[PDB]
Each structure stands twice: as C-alpha cells, then as structure tokens.
Write a protein that binds this DNA or RNA. Structure first.
Length: 960
RNA sequence: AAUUUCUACUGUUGUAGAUGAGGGAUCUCGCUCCUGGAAGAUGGUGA
RNA sequence: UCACCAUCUUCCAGGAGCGAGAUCCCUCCAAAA
C-alpha cells in the first residue's frame, strides 16, 4: 500500500578538527550551535522583527464595562452591579486592568483580572466559612454582604449546616479517645462528608456555580495568549545562535561538516560556483538549494498587510490576499503558475526554469495537493563540485571550521549487520536515490549539542580504572532530521472534529477486503507475566469435532518453526581463558562465525554442538515472555535475565515504599512468608485484588467463599455458577495461586507490633516477587532470598534515590517490549510471505477506561506505521472511545489493528467450547481435543481463543 | 564495566528495538509553613 | 457560676512554598544590498 511522510530525528558523533570560533564558548546534551544548508534561510536575521509585544497588548487591555460581555454566563443585574462595585474598590490606585503577566507587559500599574476574581472568590468562601462556624441563622445570612451566597435558598443551607454540624460532631470524636482504627474510619467518613458538601456547594449554588464557570472561562483566553507569548519570546532569541552556513564535504568514503561565517557566505558561493561540475578527483563538495510550497505562501503573502514585503509590491497586478482565494483551487494554482511564469520571479527565485516550465507551468492538476507535491518534488536540488585543495582554501580564506562524523558502523564498511538507522544515512548518498528524485530527503536544518562527561564514573571508576569505555570524555553530538516517502501525500487525520474522524478512519478501513485476510494473531491480557501469543486461520472452522481435531492435527502444515535451548547451565572457555555462559547471550553459540573466532574450534565441532545443544519444534502458539529473535531464529528462552532484572526491581520498589510508608516508630513488623494461613490474612488479601465497589456486595460467607475460591481447589469447593460469576466480576487483577502450583509466589505481610491475628497489611507479593525454575541458573533460591532480605531491613542498601529506580524500571520495561516488537514483526513478515496476504493484529482492549500494555500498544503501532497499514494519528492513547463493552461480538478497528471485549478467558475449549479445560489435560467432555503436541503451556489456549473470537467478530463486522 | 542509541544483556569490534525533538497551558491529588475562626483538656478568677 | 488569663491538642476555612499525575496543543526550509 501507500506510504507516509514519516519524520525521524537522527544523530551522530562529532570530532573537532579545527574550531577557532566554536571553542570560544567551550548534565545532558546542551545546545551550542544550530546551522542550515540553505543560504537563503540564514537571511532571517533576528533584527528582522518588530515590537510584537505592543500589538498583543491590544488584546489584553480589557475595561470594566465590557467584562460581562466576555462570558456566556448570565447574571442578574444586581449581581452584576455588585461585581462592578467590588471592581470599583479594586479600581483604586492602579488603572491598567490586565490578564496578568510579567510587569514588562503592562508596567506596575497593572492589575490581574484572574487574581481579583480569585481574590473575591476566596473572601466570600472565608466569610461564609466563619459564619458557618459561628452558628448563625438564615436571617443573619440575609443581613450579610455575601451577595454570592445570601441569595441561597433557606432550604439548601439547612443541608449544609446540618452537614457542617456533622463535621463538628465527628471532629470531637477525633479530638478524643485517640483510637487509630476508628480515627481512620472517622477521617474517611468526614472525607466523604466533605466530598458531597463540595458537591452541594459546587452544584446547588447557582450564583456560586455560575461565577465558578465564569472564572473557569476567563482563564482559557489568558492560557491561550500566554502560550503565544512564551512561544514568541522563546523563538524570538535576540541573539539567536543561527549564524553559520552548512556545507557537505566527502573524502575517502567519509563525510565532513563545514560551517561558514555569514559575512563570508556571499563571496564564498561566488568562488564556489566557478569550479568544475564533475570528476573523480578524490575531494568532493556539496551544498543544498530548494524552494518550498510553504515558503511560497510566506513569500506571496503575509507581511503584505504590514507594508513591508517588497516582493508583492512588484506583483500587485498579478493579484486581494490569500483569503480572497475562497473555495477555488483553480484560482490559487493558476495564480501561482503566473507567479512562476512571471519573469520577474524567475530573475531572483533560484528554480529549474526549464523543468518548471515543462511540468508545472505546462500541466494542470486535479487537486491542490498534486500541485504542491510536484513543486517541492522538483524544487529540491543538490549541487556538487569536483576540485582538489578545496578545504585549505576554505580554511585559508573563509575562516571555516570543520568536524568529523563517526560511529560504530561507519568505521567498518566491510560487514553486513549494519544498524537500521545507518542505512538511511547511507542510502541517502546513493545514486538510486537521485534517480528516484530524492525520495529520501534531508531537511536543511541541523543541531549541535555538548555533553559534559558525568562526574560519577570519571575519577575512580573509569579513569583510574583504565577502562575501554568512552562516556567519561567530552563529546559533540550532531542532531538531524530526515524524511521518508516524501513523494507521497502528507495525509493528516489529526485536526478533524468528531463526526469527521470516524468517517476518515472508516474510509481508511475500506482499504482492507474481507476475502484478502488469510491469518489473524492474538494477544492475551494475562498479567501472570508479560503476555502470551497465538495465531489462527479460517480453515480451522470445520463442521464437526472430528474434522476440527483432524485439522488441528496439521501443525506441521500451518505452524512456525522454533529453536529451544536444551541445557541452561551450559558454559565454555574461550581462547583468552574466561568462562562464557550460554544463557547470558546465546548469540555467541549461534552465529557460526563468532563461535569459531572465539573458541578456535572446527566446523564439525560446531555442527555437533549445534545439534546437541538445541532442539527444533513447530507450534501454533508461543510464550512471548522470554521470546527473542537471534540471527533469523525464534527461541523461547532466549533472554532469561531480562525478566529477572524486572522482578528484582519490582521487589525493591514495593518493599522499599512499604518500609518508607511513614512507618515511623511503630513496630510494623514486615514478615515474608511463602503462604497465608489465617482467614484474616486471606480476607485482608482478596480485598486488594477486587473492586471495592463490587466487593461491598459480598457477605461474610461470600467473603469466606471468595477466599476459598482463591486459596483452595475449586474442583472440590463446589461453588455455584452464580458464585463463580460473582467472584469473577469481583476479581480485579487476573492471576493464579492454586495451592502451590508450578508458579509459586511469596507474600510480604506486615504484622503490627506483634502476631496479633486480627489486623494486618498485605500487599500482594504479585507486586513484589514471583518464583520461576529458570532463574536458578543465575542464582540459587537461597542466594535469591538472602539478597531480597537485604531490602527489608538494610537501609544502607538504599543508597540510590527513587529518581534512578523509576528510570531503571521504566527502561527495563522498554527493553522487554522492544524484544516483543521484534518477535511480532518477524512473525508477521513470515506469514505474509508464506501466504501472500495481510493479517490482523487483534489485542485485548485494555485501555484508559479500564502498564506495559499501554507501552506494548504504542511501540507496536509505530513499528507498523512505517509499513502504512494503519492511519496517521495524533496519539493512539488520545483516540480510543466507547464500543468496547458488554458484547462478545464487539470490535474496534484501526487498520489491521483491532480491540475486542475481555469476556470469557482460557477456560473455553477450542473444540467443544463449553467444557472447562486446562492445558495438558484432556477435554472433560471428551470431545477428543488434545493440547499435548499443539501448544506450549496453559496460556497458549487463551491466546488461541482470543484470535478465534476476534476473527469471527471482524467478519461479522459490517459497514453495510 | 567497548555504544548515535551507554537503552537493554554479555562485553576492548556481538543479538534485538529505537521519531523525537523541543516546548507549554489547564486541571486534580500528596507534603511543609502562615493567618483567622471553630472546638476541647487543665491551673488562677465569684458563690 | 462567669469574664479573662495559663497549658496543650483536635478541626475547618483561607494564603504561600514544595511534589506527583491526567489531559491537550504547538514546534521541526526562505531573503536582497
């Protein structure tokens, strides 16, 4: 399908060769210099600007008389007069009524409208509050000046006073007897009490409420204008760093940067243009020139109204501003064509006269866009010169400054696995690009950043350590931005209104035909670990159980190949006398080349190794948790350690905040256990894992049954379907704790000063830690327990702040999701190629309404956006809406992406549906299904079910 | 504890993923200090 | 029994200073001696 004007920021390492001027000025990257490839774009000198402040001031000097006309709210004349009377008080001394800003805006004589409004608001509430506390009556109220409130009904305040009274009563209960449990309880109640009171006040008070709205109104304009000012001022850098003309020099397969002083710029070009156009004399020079549709606009119009722009002065006859071109694309296009056609234009706009003439001037266009694209399409020009001795002449005369561009990839051309970003940069220079009319486009703007090496790793840690690493040094980082598929419509769905968006996206969705679909994936929502994955094909929809099972027996025909690690413990010794462990990075044992260079072994040994250490399988599901791609291979257990780190930190954070829960001076004994015995603990736990709203509807016996339904076998605790359904609805976080099944979990209960079997605080250690077999290879459970035990009491162990903890976690999350995105991308390609069609990525519709999952959602989307299978959009998380509730048939579609309802889960059998089932266990209905040689675990059945339903919903979905 | 990515693991030239860049307004909720009022426990005030 | 003082504490309201989070919009190529 089509492609998009995707924009990608990119960056490279800079090395100083000669910086006579830059070095004069020489935590994170710091801007130091900004430069452009376009000799015209430099000419926007800062001085080329007026005193914009004064004009904006015209928008701000509101008078008292207009204020009531600035609001949608309706006020009784008496209320309006009172506001005016109040304002008259405030009208004293200062006269310049303003929005409110830096005194530079309006001089100290200024008074903020917002503040005055906020003032009055505060005074009224305060006055009212103390009246309340004093215990006066309605008549008292009426005799007061509370214009905002004295209009309040006799009825209403009754409530409020009563309620107020309630707070007083409650307060003495808190003044006295100082019992925590009840005091907390009491505080809760009061909080509630206050909640509704606010509701009451907020909602039931028209004058108050109205005014509230009024204040909430005035602030919006102030906010809109303030954004403008900030933008303007920030952009309006009086001494803006943009002072250099950017050039490109190539030499010996390496590219160099050149920055020229502005003053010298002019003359430079002159000298430049006199040289030969082509050759193979080693040294080469480059520069950019182009004209843009967007610039035409700003050339043809703009300052025109100001009487400044001299271009339009000379073409007045050709014309009536841009706005005059109302509902007529043929007018603008022909207008423009004339402009171009205009020799005068041709005398100063550096354009391909011949080319423009042949295609632009000569031809007509169906729509404005078409014209636009062509313009910039052609306008983009790349110039080259061949001559030796160039750089010294530039240095000798032009006082130029030069930089070197470098990376890991650059410094070895002679290899295959180049990083994805470097392709772009490389591909840019190629002739084929030029042949295609500069498909890939370099924006004419660049950035230079400085980054002081971080102290923390310098002195005693890498410097004195004599390490190989180069973070401790000074660095110059180049920031650039590139385009893809520029020669394509700049389709934007962002700016649409309500009804508009839905139509547009639907039109988009029409691209995909129901018969084209060949396969559909599915992503489970399970929180036991990251997630689980499945795939489906329509052919599985047979008519009878026997047909379905037989079809399901063709995994050799439909499945995907996989490699599995045999022995994790496996390790070797290299040619340098150090142990390598396979588990830590399998690649060293996969890619033949690396193996040889490391271990000095022969081809046959490699072959024997390969065969012995691994296994091959074909499956219809997968464990996404640990999955990674290596050298075009899928491995379940590729990266154990990534998970491990995740959990560990997981543990660290939750435990640390538990102790740091202002647990001051109280012996909140935090005890770590592998299970829970008493009902008090169990009941105190199930609450954490259920919705309080639905929890309150359970009785004590139901609460007891719920705990048994959690911590006890459900095959013997004969709960009813309604009980199960109620429990499922109560369930908040999906999980498993069946007795001590193959995923044992810990617990971090917190006794209160002793083993008092009545009250406790228990975070589900599902937030803290879980145990898996695989980890053992890394560390022994005893070592694992000892380590974590450090957390609970060892305060000194917490030498690092949260600011680090959080970002470590956040980035750890990023890494997993990145591995995930790799596997999913790989798979998609495979099937596509294998079946010659497009598939559907169906995801459990977890959203804002209902953390990784959000992340997973996002990054997934972007990997697919470069493919153009999905619309362009503001931001996925600012899109989603209703239509995702109470329907097993519901579906939301965005391109090939789709969201559905979470009703129903693993239990539904693939074949007989109704029979509850577990992986490795035969169907209770004896339908004939088996999961022995088709899936990997229990979770696989779920991800199979979700796709099955998702595809059925998609076909059911009808635009008809 | 080799990095445009120091972002992941291993590790002085590997496997993956990386648009992102900058920036700002509004609104809520947590924690400290200040001013006034409410309201409460003592000891002196007159039976 | 009542006006004020002594003492310490709870609460609300209002103001300032500090911290976290949702939600939205913009930025990323143009001139004459």
């Amino acid at each position: 399908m089509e492609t998009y004007k995707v924009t990608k920021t990119i960056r490279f390492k800079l090395e100083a060769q000669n910086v006579p001027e830059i070095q004069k000025d020489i935590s994170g990257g710091l801007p130091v210099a900004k430069a452009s490839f376009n000799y015209y774009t430099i000419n926007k000198k800062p001085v080329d600007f007026g005193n914009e402040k004064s004009e904006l001031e015209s928008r701000l000097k509101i008078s008292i008389d207009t204020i009531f006309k600035l609001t949608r709210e309706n006020f009784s004349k008496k209320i309006e007069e009172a506001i005016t009377a109040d304002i008259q008080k405030e009208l004293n001394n200062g006269k310049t009524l303003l929005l409110g800003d830096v005194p530079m805006l309006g001089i100290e004589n200024y008074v903020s409208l917002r503040q005055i409004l906020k003032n009055i608001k505060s005074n009224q509430k305060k006055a009212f509050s103390d009246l309340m506390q004093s215990g006066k009556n309605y008549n008292e109220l009426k005799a007061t000046n509370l214009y905002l409130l004295n209009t309040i009904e006799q009825r209403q305040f009754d409530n409020y006073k009563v309620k107020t009274n309630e707070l007083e009563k409650l307060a003495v209960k808190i003044n006295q007897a100082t019992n925590d449990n009840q005091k907390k309880e009491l505080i809760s109640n009061k909080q509630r009490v206050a909640k509704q009171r606010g509701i009451i006040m907020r909602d039931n008070f028209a004058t108050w409420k109205s005014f509230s709205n009024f204040y909430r109104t005035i602030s919006q304009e102030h906010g809109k204008i303030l954004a403008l000012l900030k933008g303007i001022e920030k952009e309006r850098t009086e001494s803006q760093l943009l002072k250099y003309w950017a050039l490109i020099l190539e030499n010996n397969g390496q590219h160099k940067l050149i920055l020229i002083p502005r003053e010298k710029a002019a003359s430079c070009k002159q000298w430049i243009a006199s040289l030969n156009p082509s050759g193979d004399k080693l040294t080469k020079l480059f520069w950019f020139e182009s004209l843009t549709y967007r610039s035409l606009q700003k050339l043809c119009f703009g300052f025109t109204e100001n009487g400044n722009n001299k271009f339009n002065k000379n073409i007045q006859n050709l014309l009536n501003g841009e706005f005059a071109f109302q509902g007529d694309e043929q007018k603008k296009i022909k207008f423009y064509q004339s402009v171009l056609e205009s020799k005068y234009a041709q005398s100063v706009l550096n354009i391909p006269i011949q080319q423009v003439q042949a295609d632009i001037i000569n031809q007509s266009f169906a729509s404005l866009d078409d014209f636009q694209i062509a313009l910039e399409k052609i306008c983009y020009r790349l110039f080259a010169v061949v001559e030796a001795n160039i750089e010294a002449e530039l240095l000798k005369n032009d006082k130029a400054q030069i930089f070197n561009i470098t990376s890991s990839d650059l410094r070895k051309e002679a290899k295959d696995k180049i990083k994805s970003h470097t392709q772009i940069w490389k591909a840019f220079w190629t002739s084929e690009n030029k042949q295609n009319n500069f498909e890939t486009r370099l924006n004419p703007e660049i950035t230079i950043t400085y980054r002081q090496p971080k102290q923390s790793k310098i002195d005693k840690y890498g410097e004195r350590s004599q390490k190989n690493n180069r973070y401790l040094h000074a660095q110059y980082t180049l920031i650039t931005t590139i385009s893809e598929h520029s020669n394509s419509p700049t389709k934007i769905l962002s700016f649409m209104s309500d009804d508009e968006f839905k139509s547009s996206v639907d039109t988009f969705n029409k691209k995909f035909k129901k018969d084209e679909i060949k396969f559909a994936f599915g992503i489970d929502n399970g929180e036991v670990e990251l997630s689980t994955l499945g795939v489906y094909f329509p052919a599985f929809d047979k008519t009878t159980y026997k047909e379905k099972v037989a079809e399901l027996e063709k995994v050799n025909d439909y499945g995907f190949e996989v490699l599995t690690i045999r022995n994790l413990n496996y390790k070797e010794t290299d040619y340098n006398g150090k142990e390598r462990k396979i588990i830590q990075n399998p690649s060293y044992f996969l890619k033949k080349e690396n193996y040889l260079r490391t271990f000095n072994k022969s081809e046959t040994a490699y072959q024997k190794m390969f065969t012995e250490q691994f296994e091959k399988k074909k499956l219809l599901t997968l464990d996404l948790t640990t999955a990674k791609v290596i050298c075009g291979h899928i491995v379940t257990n590729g990266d154990v350690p990534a998970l491990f780190n995740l959990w560990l930190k997981h543990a660290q954070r939750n435990i640390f905040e538990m102790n740091d829960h202002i647990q001051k001076e109280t012996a909140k004994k935090i005890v770590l256990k592998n299970q829970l015995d008493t009902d008090n603990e169990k009941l105190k736990f199930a609450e954490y894992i259920s919705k309080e709203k639905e929890f309150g509807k359970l009785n004590d016996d139901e609460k007891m049954k719920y705990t048994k339904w959690i911590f006890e076998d459900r095959d013997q605790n004969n709960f009813t379907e309604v009980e199960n359904k109620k429990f499922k609805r109560c369930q908040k976080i999906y999980g498993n704790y069946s007795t001590k099944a193959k995923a044992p979990v810990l617990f971090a209960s917190c006794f209160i000063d002793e083993e008092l079997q009545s009250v406790t605080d228990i975070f589900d250690v599902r937030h803290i830690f879980k145990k898996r077999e695989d980890f053992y290879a890394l560390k022994t459970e005893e070592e694992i327990k000892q380590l974590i035990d450090s957390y609970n009491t060892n305060r000194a162990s917490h030498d690092i702040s949260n600011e680090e903890l959080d970002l470590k976690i956040l980035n750890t999350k990023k890494a997993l999701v990145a591995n995930a995105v790799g596997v999913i991308d790989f798979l998609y390609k495979h099937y596509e190629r294998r079946l010659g069609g497009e598939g559907l990525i169906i995801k459990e519709g977890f959203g804002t309404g209902k953390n990784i999952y959000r992340i997973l959602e996002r990054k997934l989307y972007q990997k697919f956006q470069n493919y153009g299978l999905v619309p362009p959009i503001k931001s996925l998380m600012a899109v989603r809406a209703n239509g995702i509730e109470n329907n097993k048939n519901a579906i939301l579609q965005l391109g090939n992406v789709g969201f559905i309802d979470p009703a129903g889960t693993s239990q539904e059998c693939p074949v007989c549906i109704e029979g509850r089932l577990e992986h490795t266990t035969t169907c209770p209905n004896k339908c004939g299904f088996n999961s022995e040689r088709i899936m990997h675990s229990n979770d696989g059945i779920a991800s199979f079910n979700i796709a099955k339903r998702g595809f059925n919903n998609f076909v059911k979905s009808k635009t008809d």
